[PDB]
Amino acid sequence: EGECSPLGEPCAGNPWGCCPGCICIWQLTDRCVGNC
């Protein structure tokens, strides 16, 4: 699986990050915050 999920897929790899509507932090691991 490589099509991201609502808050789930890490930001390391790209476009393996989090689906549109959320922003990445990666100041600890790769936590996405927002409303997606």
Side-chain angles (χ1 to χ4, degrees):
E1 287 180 90
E3 53 180 270
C4 70
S5 295
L7 244 77
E9 254 289 272
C11 309
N14 286 270
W16 291 80
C18 301
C19 310
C22 283
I23 49 283
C24 184
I25 300 303
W26 195 33
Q27 290 181 90
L28 203 148
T29 21
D30 54 87
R31 286 181 180 184
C32 298
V33 275
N35 204 90
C36 58

